[PDB]
Write an enzyme that holds these catalytic residues in place. Structure first.
Site, PDB file in Angstrom:
ATOM      1  N   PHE A   1       8.918   4.734   8.784  1.00 58.75           N
ATOM      2  CA  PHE A   1       8.722   3.838   9.915  1.00 58.75           C
ATOM      3  C   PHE A   1       8.649   2.403   9.389  1.00 58.75           C
ATOM      4  O   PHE A   1       9.582   1.626   9.595  1.00 58.75           O
ATOM      5  CB  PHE A   1       7.453   4.233  10.675  1.00 58.75           C
TER       6      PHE A   1
ATOM      7  N   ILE B   1       0.825  -1.203   0.000  1.00 54.58           N
ATOM      8  CA  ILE B   1       0.000   0.000   0.000  1.00 54.58           C
ATOM      9  C   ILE B   1       0.860   1.255   0.000  1.00 54.58           C
ATOM     10  O   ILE B   1       0.660   2.154  -0.818  1.00 54.58           O
ATOM     11  CB  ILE B   1      -0.975  -0.019   1.198  1.00 54.58           C
ATOM     12  N   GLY B   2       1.826   1.338   0.915  1.00 54.11           N
ATOM     13  CA  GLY B   2       2.733   2.462   0.943  1.00 54.11           C
ATOM     14  C   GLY B   2       4.043   2.086   1.603  1.00 54.11           C
ATOM     15  O   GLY B   2       4.254   0.940   2.008  1.00 54.11           O
TER      16      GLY B   2
ATOM     17  N   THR C   1       6.530  -0.298   6.119  1.00 55.71           N
ATOM     18  CA  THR C   1       5.689  -0.425   4.940  1.00 55.71           C
ATOM     19  C   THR C   1       4.357  -1.066   5.305  1.00 55.71           C
ATOM     20  O   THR C   1       4.253  -1.815   6.280  1.00 55.71           O
ATOM     21  CB  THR C   1       6.390  -1.246   3.857  1.00 55.71           C
TER      22      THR C   1
ATOM     23  N   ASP D   1      -1.932  14.121  16.231  1.00 53.55           N
ATOM     24  CA  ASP D   1      -1.729  14.340  14.803  1.00 53.55           C
ATOM     25  C   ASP D   1      -3.049  14.149  14.058  1.00 53.55           C
ATOM     26  O   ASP D   1      -3.140  13.399  13.084  1.00 53.55           O
ATOM     27  CB  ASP D   1      -0.637  13.412  14.266  1.00 53.55           C
TER      28      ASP D   1
ATOM     29  N   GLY E   1       6.824   4.118   4.315  1.00 55.23           N
ATOM     30  CA  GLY E   1       7.200   5.281   5.086  1.00 55.23           C
ATOM     31  C   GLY E   1       8.507   5.085   5.845  1.00 55.23           C
ATOM     32  O   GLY E   1       9.093   3.996   5.867  1.00 55.23           O
TER      33      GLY E   1
HETATM   34  C1  QOP Z   1      -1.725  -1.249   8.805  1.00 59.83           C
HETATM   35  C2  QOP Z   1      -2.302   0.159   8.715  1.00 59.83           C
HETATM   36  N1  QOP Z   1      -3.643   0.097   8.159  1.00 59.83           N
HETATM   37  C3  QOP Z   1      -3.959   0.889   6.981  1.00 59.83           C
HETATM   38  O1  QOP Z   1      -3.122   1.582   6.512  1.00 59.83           O
HETATM   39  C4  QOP Z   1      -5.366   0.835   6.381  1.00 59.83           C
HETATM   40  N2  QOP Z   1      -6.370   0.424   7.134  1.00 59.83           N
HETATM   41  C5  QOP Z   1      -7.602   0.355   6.667  1.00 59.83           C
HETATM   42  N3  QOP Z   1      -7.893   0.684   5.424  1.00 59.83           N
HETATM   43  C6  QOP Z   1      -6.944   1.098   4.606  1.00 59.83           C
HETATM   44  N4  QOP Z   1      -7.264   1.461   3.238  1.00 59.83           N
HETATM   45  C7  QOP Z   1      -5.635   1.187   5.058  1.00 59.83           C
HETATM   46 CL1  QOP Z   1      -4.371   1.752   3.928  1.00 59.83          CL
HETATM   47  C8  QOP Z   1      -2.307   0.781  10.113  1.00 59.83           C
HETATM   48  N5  QOP Z   1      -1.752   0.184  11.241  1.00 59.83           N
HETATM   49  C9  QOP Z   1      -1.917   1.042  12.423  1.00 59.83           C
HETATM   50  C10 QOP Z   1      -2.598   2.236  12.069  1.00 59.83           C
HETATM   51  C11 QOP Z   1      -2.940   3.363  13.044  1.00 59.83           C
HETATM   52  O2  QOP Z   1      -3.592   4.283  12.677  1.00 59.83           O
HETATM   53  N6  QOP Z   1      -2.448   3.298  14.412  1.00 59.83           N
HETATM   54  C12 QOP Z   1      -2.736   4.348  15.375  1.00 59.83           C
HETATM   55  C13 QOP Z   1      -4.043   4.740  15.616  1.00 59.83           C
HETATM   56  C14 QOP Z   1      -4.292   5.745  16.542  1.00 59.83           C
HETATM   57  C15 QOP Z   1      -5.723   6.203  16.829  1.00 59.83           C
HETATM   58  F1  QOP Z   1      -6.061   5.873  18.110  1.00 59.83           F
HETATM   59  F2  QOP Z   1      -5.809   7.556  16.668  1.00 59.83           F
HETATM   60  F3  QOP Z   1      -6.581   5.588  15.963  1.00 59.83           F
HETATM   61  C16 QOP Z   1      -3.214   6.320  17.198  1.00 59.83           C
HETATM   62 CL2  QOP Z   1      -3.475   7.615  18.399  1.00 59.83          CL
HETATM   63  C17 QOP Z   1      -1.932   5.879  16.913  1.00 59.83           C
HETATM   64  N7  QOP Z   1      -1.742   4.923  16.024  1.00 59.83           N
HETATM   65  S1  QOP Z   1      -2.942   2.227  10.504  1.00 59.83           S
END
Ligand code: QOP
Ligand code: QOP
EC number: 2.7.11.1
Lengths: 263, 263
Positions: free
Chosen positions: A20, A15-16, A22, A128, A18
């Site tokens: 940190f 998908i991407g 991928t 953020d 970064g």
């Molecule tokens: C693997 C990757 N998932 C995707 O990218 C994706 N998911 C669904 N649909 C898509 N099209 C894509 Cl593309 C992710 N792993 C951890 C992710 C994350 O946001 N962690 C997070 C969340 C919070 C929150 F509490 F604010 F929510 C905080 Cl405060 C700090 N960290 S995102």
């Protein structure tokens, strides 16, 4: 224990990528998304960021927060969440320029406030919040997350640090009021369709002028059909002083009240 | 600690009464559903059933399982989950007048297998999987749970496996018993009718199925039903438990069939 054993996840298309890790679309009891931390041997800083991001995702169980599903340690530090179809709010308002009716613009703001309120209730600061981190799952359900990229010194170096060096290493500007300001900018994007300070050339000005209370988003760019409470709520969320900004409880209350008046 | 303090949830209109207590539509950072045990002094038996259902719902974090959000102890034992709009799968196939396309019927089976596989992976037995407990959130996303009254029943027998009819203790409930329940759901999806719809009374259906003398009439499947589904449905309705496949190999063939139609 949400740890996912090595061998169950079927890593698929990327998908991407970064600074940190991928992100791929994986298979694990359905469609999931996995952020593989490109750390064959993570440093204690990178390891702590992994334990912090998973520790925050554990405390989240809400319809408008991205569903955490599990994490991995072998052979790569990974985080597994649900797979959502659609685009980010930044992509719909500033790249595709999709026209949302005022009914849906309020609905997106209501679901966003719902997720943000649940975070502050769980004593969780987003740190953020931005329209790029607001994913519109199936172009309907709002999913809040941190799709970031760039995610000790105050110990062995303390006896030699000057007083002014401590004015910059013990202040945490990230608070619930900082997230309210971030939500206010999202309201600006929804109600104006443009990014704030769209008439400013470079970012060197936007950084110093906003931080010094000399630059504020031009509120006259709101739509004509914008409710008079949205423009007032947006202004209160963009106050220069932190204490003058309202909290998400009374924010979500006014948005949900406005939503039921719009048929 | 997912306990919700008394005073945050705004209990609203009564919807139904499932499991143990009655269920209302509550307000808690958005729309939620709360199942309050209306017993001012719950017996230790009712308390243990409460602690068991929350202990299982804590271990669930999947897109096709009902999102557990919290529980309460004062002044009533309560369980708080997400609030989903729509109707149950039983209401759509045997009560409503709309016919679902074969593409969507396979998709509903995929989401059900996804959720069921995640449960068995987490070492969780549903014990009561049926089309009434399969909610179609927004008429699209399948949500598996243990409701009761979502949207006299009688037919709550049709999903119990043969070995489940020769009761022992808490041993006939197994992964194979849930696989048989999934086979009956496949029968409802691919035929649009309930199994044993040509039987007058229930006196036969219980004793005849438990004695291996009665099986669902597989000739009632639609003409456009894929031959892979009819074979998978028959293997999921085997009289012996060991001869029934596991959800890994069940979900594998369903997702494989799904990609042959989606392209
Ligand atoms: C693997 C990757 N998932 C995707 O990218 C994706 N998911 C669904 N649909 C898509 N099209 C894509 Cl593309 C992710 N792993 C951890 C992710 C994350 O946001 N962690 C997070 C969340 C919070 C929150 F509490 F604010 F929510 C905080 Cl405060 C700090 N960290 S995102
Ligand atoms: C509060 C009440 N929520 C609703 O009723 C409701 N929710 C959304 N939309 C609606 N229209 C309604 Cl009406 C519920 N509390 C616990 C519920 C539940 O299913 N527990 C459960 C789950 C499992 C599972 F693992 F299989 F998932 C198992 Cl094995 C055993 N027990 S349901």
């Amino acid at each position: 224990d949400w740890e996912i054993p090595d061998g169950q996840i079927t890593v698929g298309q990327r998908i991407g990528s970064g600074s940190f890790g991928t992100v791929y679309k994986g298979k694990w009891h359905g469609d999931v998304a996995v952020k593989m931390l490109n750390v064959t041997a993570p440093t204690p800083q990178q390891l702590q960021a992994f334990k912090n991001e998973v520790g925050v995702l554990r405390k989240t169980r809400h319809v408008n927060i991205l569903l955490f599903m599990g994490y991995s340690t072998k052979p790569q530090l990974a985080i597994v969440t649900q797979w959502c179809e659609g685009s980010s709010l930044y992509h719909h308002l500033h790249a595709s320029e999709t026209k949302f009716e005022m009914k849906k613009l309020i609905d997106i703001a209501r679901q966003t406030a719902r997720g943000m309120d649940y975070l502050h209730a769980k004593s969780i600061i987003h740190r953020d919040l931005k329209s790029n981190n607001i994913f519109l799952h199936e172009d309907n359900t709002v999913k809040i997350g941190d799709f970031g990229l760039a995610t000790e010194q105050l110990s062995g170096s303390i006896l030699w640090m000057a007083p002014e060096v401590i004015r910059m290493q013990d202040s945490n500007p990230y608070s619930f009021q900082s997230d309210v300001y971030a939500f206010g900018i999202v309201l600006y994007e929804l109600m104006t369709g443009q990014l704030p300070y769209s008439n400013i050339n470079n970012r060197d000005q936007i950084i110093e002028m906003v931080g010094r209370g000399s630059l504020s988003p031009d509120l006259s760019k709101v739509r004509s059909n914008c409710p008079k409470r949205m423009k007032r709520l947006m202004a209160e969320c963009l106050k220069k002083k932190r204490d003058e900004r309202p909290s998400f409880p009374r924010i979500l209350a006014e948005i949900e009240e406005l939503a039921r008046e719009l048929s």
